[PDB]
């Protein structure tokens, strides 16, 4: 579960870089889409943090 | 000729089918922004050399 947490947290960093790239390219609609992927990864990472604390 | 023209529009319709496939390519397109800037960055270095 600690491996899944590190995978989804580095996937959130990847999407944050895609959001930065979209904003420099003026594609604000893709920046919002990337931020939505980032949010679902940080919210599932909090579920894995909870699972890991119990474990 | 008119019914054959209706048959010719089957090729035109097939062109839009490739356009819907290209729609998936538009979501993938951010990779082309990094690809295009990269080739100009090494080309600028090659021109400067």
UniProtKB/Swiss-Prot annotation, chain B:
Localization per Swiss-Prot or TrEMBL: Cell inner membrane
Gene disruption: observed consequences: Essential, it cannot be completely disrupted. Cells with very low levels of protein have no ordered thylakoids, are barely green and are non-photosynthetic.
Role played: Required for thylakoid formation.
Annotated family: Belongs to the PspA/Vipp/IM30 family.
Protein's name according to its UniProt entry: Membrane-associated protein Vipp1
The species this protein was found in: Synechocystis sp. (strain ATCC 27184 / PCC 6803 / Kazusa)
Gene responsible for this protein: vipp1
């Amino acid at each position: 579960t600690e491996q899944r947490l590190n995978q989804d947290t580095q996937e959130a960093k990847k999407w944050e870089d895609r959001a930065k790239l979209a904003l420099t390219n003026g594609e604000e609609n893709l920046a919002r889409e990337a931020l939505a992927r980032k949010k679902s990864l940080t919210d599932t990472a909090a579920a894995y943090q909870t699972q890991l604390a119990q474990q | 000729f008119e019914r054959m023209e209706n048959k010719v529009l089957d090729m035109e319709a097939t062109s839009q089918a490739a356009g819907e496939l290209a729609g998936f390519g538009i979501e993938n397109q951010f990779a082309q922004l990094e690809a295009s800037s990269g080739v100009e960055d090494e080309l600028a270095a090659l021109k400067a050399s």
